[PDB]
Design a protein around this ligand. Sequence first.
Ligand SMILES: Nc1ncnc2c1ncn2[C@@H]1O[C@H](COP(=O)(O)OP(=O)(O)O)[C@@H](O)[C@H]1O
Ligand SMILES: [Mg+2]
Ligand SMILES: [Mg+2]
Ligand SMILES: [Mg+2]
Ligand SMILES: [Mg+2]
Ligand SMILES: [Mg+2]
Lengths: 510, 504, 499, 503
Amino acid sequence: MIPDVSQALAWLEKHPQALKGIQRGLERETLRVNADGTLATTGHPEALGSALTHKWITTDFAEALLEFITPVDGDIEHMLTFMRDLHRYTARNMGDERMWPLSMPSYIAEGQDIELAQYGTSNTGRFKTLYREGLKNRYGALMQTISGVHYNFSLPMAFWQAKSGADAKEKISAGYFRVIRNYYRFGWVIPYLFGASPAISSSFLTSLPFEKTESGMYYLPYATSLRLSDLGYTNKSQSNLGITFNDLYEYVAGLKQAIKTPSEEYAKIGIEKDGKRLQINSNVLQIENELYAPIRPKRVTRSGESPSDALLRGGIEYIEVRSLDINPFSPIGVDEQQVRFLDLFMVWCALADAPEMSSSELACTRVNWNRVILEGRKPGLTLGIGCETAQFPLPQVGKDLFRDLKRVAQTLDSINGGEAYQKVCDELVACFDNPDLTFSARILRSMIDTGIGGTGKAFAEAYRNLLREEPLEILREEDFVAEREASERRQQEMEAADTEPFAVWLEKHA
Amino acid sequence: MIPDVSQALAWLEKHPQALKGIQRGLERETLRVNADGTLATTGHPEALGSALTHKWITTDFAEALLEFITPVDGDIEHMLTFMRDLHRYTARNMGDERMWPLSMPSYIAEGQDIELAQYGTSNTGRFKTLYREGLKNRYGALMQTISGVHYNFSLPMAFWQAKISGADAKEKISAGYFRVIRNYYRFGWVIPYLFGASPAISSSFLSLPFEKTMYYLPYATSLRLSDLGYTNSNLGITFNDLYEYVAGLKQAIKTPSEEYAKIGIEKDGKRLQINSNVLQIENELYAPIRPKRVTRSGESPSDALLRGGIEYIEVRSLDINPFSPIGVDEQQVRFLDLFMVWCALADAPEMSSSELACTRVNWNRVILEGRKPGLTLGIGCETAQFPLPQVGKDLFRDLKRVAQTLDSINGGEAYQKVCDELVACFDNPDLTFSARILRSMIDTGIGGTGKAFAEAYRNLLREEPLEILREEDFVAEREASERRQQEMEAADTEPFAVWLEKHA
Amino acid sequence: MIPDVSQALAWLEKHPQALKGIQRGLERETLRVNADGTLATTGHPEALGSALTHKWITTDFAEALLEFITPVDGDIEHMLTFMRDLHRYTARNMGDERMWPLSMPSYIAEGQDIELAQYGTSNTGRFKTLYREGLKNRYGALMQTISGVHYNFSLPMAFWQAKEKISAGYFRVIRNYYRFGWVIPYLFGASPAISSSFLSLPFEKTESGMYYLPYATSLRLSDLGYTNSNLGITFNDLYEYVAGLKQAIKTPSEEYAKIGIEKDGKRLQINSNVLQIENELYAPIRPKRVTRSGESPSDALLRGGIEYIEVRSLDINPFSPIGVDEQQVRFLDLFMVWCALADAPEMSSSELACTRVNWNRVILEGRKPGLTLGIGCETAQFPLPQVGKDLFRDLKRVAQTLDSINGGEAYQKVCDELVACFDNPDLTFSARILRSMIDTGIGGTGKAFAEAYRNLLREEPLEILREEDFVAEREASERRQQEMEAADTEPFAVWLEKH
Amino acid sequence: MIPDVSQALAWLEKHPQALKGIQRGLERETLRVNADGTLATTGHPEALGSALTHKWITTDFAEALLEFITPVDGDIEHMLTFMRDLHRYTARNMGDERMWPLSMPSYIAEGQDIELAQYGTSNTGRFKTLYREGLKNRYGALMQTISGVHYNFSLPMAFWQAKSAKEKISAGYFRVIRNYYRFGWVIPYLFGASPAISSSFLSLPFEKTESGMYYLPYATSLRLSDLGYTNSNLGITFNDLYEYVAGLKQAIKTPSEEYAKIGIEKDGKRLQINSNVLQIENELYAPIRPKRVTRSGESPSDALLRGGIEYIEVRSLDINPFSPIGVDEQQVRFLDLFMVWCALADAPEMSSSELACTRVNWNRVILEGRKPGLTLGIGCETAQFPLPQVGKDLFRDLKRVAQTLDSINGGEAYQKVCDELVACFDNPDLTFSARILRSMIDTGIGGTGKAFAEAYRNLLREEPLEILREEDFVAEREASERRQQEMEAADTEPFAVWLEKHA
Ligand SMILES: Nc1ncnc2c1ncn2[C@@H]1O[C@H](COP(=O)(O)OP(=O)(O)O)[C@@H](O)[C@H]1O
Ligand SMILES: [Mg+2]
Ligand SMILES: [Mg+2]
Ligand SMILES: [Mg+2]
Ligand SMILES: [Mg+2]
Ligand SMILES: [Mg+2]
């Protein structure tokens, strides 16, 4: 089932310097909670300054939902250390609150009570909140509290150079679409290794054969990542809207068409209700982020550009992988082993040939993802090519892919010096013979002993105590203070610069 | 530019009995006004009973907007007399109020608080009012006070037999009516030419090279059909095939409109409209002509077409005839019979929705400047080169043959007379309704002209005795109509907002 | 989710004559009701002769359940006209009674006294009635008065020439029909509502007292309808299938042994096995061969292989006086040919069971915006609209091949019309009949249609069959029954064993 | 509204090879600016030699307005690469200056003293500079700094040979021009990239940002508006070669009350060439222009009379802000499709006021082309056709021309382009102008210009040459300076007297 990539591997083995200079960035989300596991209802902590403008620390959907963002970086340890400093500083400046360490929250009784991220009174800040109001009304606040890690990745120019004019940005875009098509066909290996959400609170809910406990914890005995299942998110699958990844313009046209298509469903919600604005507009997507997407091509926008404008202007700059659950075994929710595996997998995805796929061939790649998501750890599980009958045992497919990943590891290890990528392959490949080594088996044992609540409360306490004692390593305290002051100032400035009232301004971005 | 219809007229001539028993019905709308021409703000005249259920008299958009409807019927004189009985009775039972005799209203500024039509508390009743709230909020109440005449028409089975057992019937009849419709779009501009009666509008309604005083265009026929009138394109709806038509129409009631969502579904707890889709219901699709089948109880217009095929055709493009106390007359009706039949005979290739947009070019010429000397028309979008009068005459040689045939089965010369009268309008546009009514409006204004005719027509009608309906028949119907409303208002279990949910 | 068929299609496109000579037949059932909508209690109308032996008109489960059957035939218009002559004649010869136009009845209470179909006094007659007694006692009479339409279909010899190979090819058809045939109730299901008499699921009730699911298509096919599996019948091999079938005839049932076989001399079933006879295996589609004298269906199959297939999924089309129309028949032609072209991997017993999951989704909520289908038991993934369009890309190609041997564009017109239903489930039979039932009720709607179709059908002249053909067939059928009745037949118990 | 072109398309699908060997050339203009966006006041960069005689690089109106010209070519990739080589070389040889990347400039004041292109002391040079002095005095220098791309196009002989000469070809290109007037507004719809205008250029419902930028919310190309690069009072028509040329030659002799008030001389300095409606024929500004390469100091109109229309010059392209060279393959292929379509569709002859009527749709698209529910009309008649439906009707035909070209070229590039561009008719937000407007509302014309100019300079300075070697630029620098020298030495009469001989 794994295709044959000997030509591309051989090519890579003869050009190791083509991989020198990979760039990465991490985003990690986590709810602020009290010791009892419930969402804090305090505001974004003072010491973090303005969530709207801050460089490293912001909020996602909810006021209690923190997001840490590392600046693009070529060194894995440097980037993880940076991430850990954000966590350390935050952990000691949020009063008695702490950070929820799983993707799935514990029982929440009233989704409707959750405060949306608040961004002040400037037009940009309100738009951002109104966007969330919109999401709240379309899909419910509850699902937005489920969190994850994004891993952002780009190959160096050297890679493309070893593989002229206006073609360059086109070859690069084509190669990233290749990576994306391959992620669709094979990326189920990610939730298999690192899925960490085999259980969900009944407060968040089916034909599924759930085991139940009296506190409302539901779980599937072999699942890997319910975060990625239909129960773990509410919005429209890019796959489902019929967006494809064969060609850049086509992709952008599909995306932009969704921004402009009105929706009968969302019009029923209404745009206003008692002088309170309820969504930005009533289109399928309010803005491009509303598209649910396990993986997404990107380019950093310039001032005023929409994300898709940037793509059209400059082609794909880098890939965002969104399918990683929070790593509950790391205080920062992600570790070196995961980052190195994604390096190897993404690189492999860029090498393997990937035929174009129509909407329904893409839909078929999801059959395997669903098997792995809901019962990836089942003894005897078999996978198939697209929709064809399942017939390849999962472990053997894993070992096949790792035969290749190991060759890429050898190449990366020889340029970085050391053995770090090879060790990672050996550690991970073992998970195909023993599914009990995977994150989701480990975290299910924990959740059976103490619940989602008990497991999250206990890690959150333990992690709070590491994080708040550890010395800052790269950022120092005065950097947090400086960035607090500067972020607050940029917010005062946007507030003062507005000249039109929100209603008028809105009528030109709605 | 008129197609060759020889083969079919010859067929018709050998089959005169095939046209025996054409069925017709008319609807005619008119605003209740005061002596001074302002809109009456009183309610639907007590004597008429329940607008909601009455068999012959109701309202349209506005509480003050009367509409008279005749039951389907095979006899022209009978139908016209019935319509007149309705007017007679009504004029005698509305105090000092009288009926505006023009299409275009006059004493109404933009956003005048025009009372929507009222139908009691029933769910069906409250839904109809809400539809109108929607229409008001989407288009303005003002445009909804422009009034017209609809002519409803069906060929007799004998016609289709003379050209089919079981399931075939339904298909052939439908196919013939879509032909009628396509031909109407190609050639129906002849209607506003002859009978358009709104070459002027009051300022309230207002690009075009107007003249002021009251706005008008010197050669205009029917502004009620222009963009400033009873009009409301981008829909892709075609007339080739029953299934395609219904699919397109059903698609439109399910299509959300951004513009309309921005009105809201309800503001401050007052429900502003049934929904925010392009059409709230299928009635909102304004069109010059429309295929129809009588709906079962609560069944939708498009369901009925899909179940039974096209039953009859509704021609919607007639302005009020200002020269008749009942707003329509025998000359118009007979011309429509002739033109509809011709539409059923002539070959009419299928049209894509952009070919249909091209047929509107001639309509637009005729609408805004149909009486211009030298005016020429084209085939669709192709360059104009056919002088209008020669096209009319050409059409009328065919209508003449159809008229001979109809006259030979009835007995008499009545249809031939109509051909001879109307064909003269092509040589002299000054004989057409719009030339004549424009002279009158340039001189006394839309206002003056309307009040005068209103007043004359009222006096005439007040004295005329009833002929088919007896006073007793209106009284029984008042009672039975009010009875049916109560019998509905009571039979409602669940409250409006929930019933709406299931039907919105 | 649709398999790739483009190779088989290309072959078909190079061999259009391989489809010339498709044969079809229809069966359509309907309750005889009074104008008030209650079930008639009179006997089979006498102008129709012997239900037991008549060639075209008979009864199904109940004495008031008419069934109309067309003789196998190559021409669509002709088959539908014949069906219509049967309706016309009957409508003008059943007194003030009329034909219920919907699959689901109302005005019939649970455990009401439904007279079983009566076939006179011969071995065969008594046997047919006894089998019904058996069904009544096993599953209840009520379920048996749900009516439907069966479409019977066979490919010409020409097709295969481009006999054990004929059977394997019809099994391919069945396998594909299980995996994908939910498209039929989606387009044509017409029983979204159900009388209370038939009562888990999120039903709505009307003040009127009517139950319904907002997005349902065909409750007739649901578990509350004409239904039921751990029998393990498979459709991979002719003999494999026939064996499974015959074992099912011989397998005793704990539950039915409980009913008794005799209680006070009245025999209560044919036997106490899971299936009394082969007909009892209810299924959406069924392999078939016309049976000889005293032969059983399986014997028939064993002798000559599958001759044709019977598609049993169609609800009564509420919008046609004869309960089925040309658009349906044309669609099934396309669908059944496609089923014969697509590769269908063999399927085990429980793989076949998994195909029900999609059926149930479409049945219970097929019109739900955003509905997704899966493959077998697996997680729903594929949006219903895209799946349908994919199938119609292929059917459109089949349609071109059929139009070009027949002349015209009739098959392609059907593709265009119906694909439109995937963009708007409000065009489907079930959205339409539901709107109407929500205003007036099952009863209301049924009575209104039944009355209009009565008046309509009584005024239409006969076209293929003359009144005198019905009289002859009445008399011949009456005579055929008398001759069987007067035969010196074997003792019943022995006779039974001999079946 | 779109004519039916079935017979011509059926004809084409039968004679595919009728289109093999289309010829194209591009002109692209750009201002030389500093990192701060202000107009560079240095001279024509030295590495480029003589703007007057150089073969590929020259100036337009202003000394700071660069212009790149590709030599006529049959290969699209080759042509684009060649244009790019010119840019690369220039970008490396202009100090810290860069190329302004938008049609509309931002940091240029009204009445700003812009240095006119300088061509030296030869009579020809001084004439060219004087022409500009004329334009400056007649319309202001500001307008002349708005820049554009020209797409030059000819069908191969194989095309005319199959369609049934010299007079047939001219009638064909006139049919192209009449079609272009009727339907060419499709160009600024797709590729207009100037929906905002700086206040320097200032009855229309303009919006204005706190920063001081004016714009129309649905506009496409204000470069084509009255406020842009425009001068039509002349009633020149496109029915017949001799009528066209007569109209044009007459225009050059017709005096103008307005220009006479300016004067021919003032305090010893000559102000214009004459005080006629057009000083010379180039002054006639239009969206499209019929052309022949002029041989032997012949005038453009002379060339046309001598040899008929050789090619078409489509002048209505704005600078593509999303391409370092101001134009991309997608635009070129679309213009191939649309010009070929314009040669195939029937085009009745048009009076000068029928021509004026075609301008009504143009203005609509120019000023509010992206407005939801905009409708177009035929000529001056009631607006009745929703633009999306019209555009899609057109693309049904372009798509068949596209199949033809792809079958003779191999591949699917032309069909891909139809699929891309047809999407703009369902979604105006894909068009160049919506994309550039979002960026301008936010950082203004200045901010957006500077930012793009900065990135393209970095990009181009790094790219190696691909078709021209550095030797070639050096070789042409020397050869162009020589020719100028020669022309300067070879002059006999002082310019004042030479000028009377070419009044
Ligand atoms: N088969 C038919 N042929 C001709 N006219 C008909 C037929 N059926 C109904 N009509 C007429 O059509 C008209 C319908 O009027 P109305 O109830 O006002 O409907 P709407 O307002 O929807 O057009 C009535 O005048 C009726 O007489
Ligand atoms: Mg283990
Ligand atoms: Mg009305
Ligand atoms: Mg039966
Ligand atoms: Mg059967
Ligand atoms: Mg030029």
